[PDB]
């Protein structure tokens, strides 16, 4: 996961 909040 790598789903950054931006």
């Given at each position: 996961h790598?789903?950054?909040?931006?």
């Open positions: 790598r789903f950054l909040r931006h």
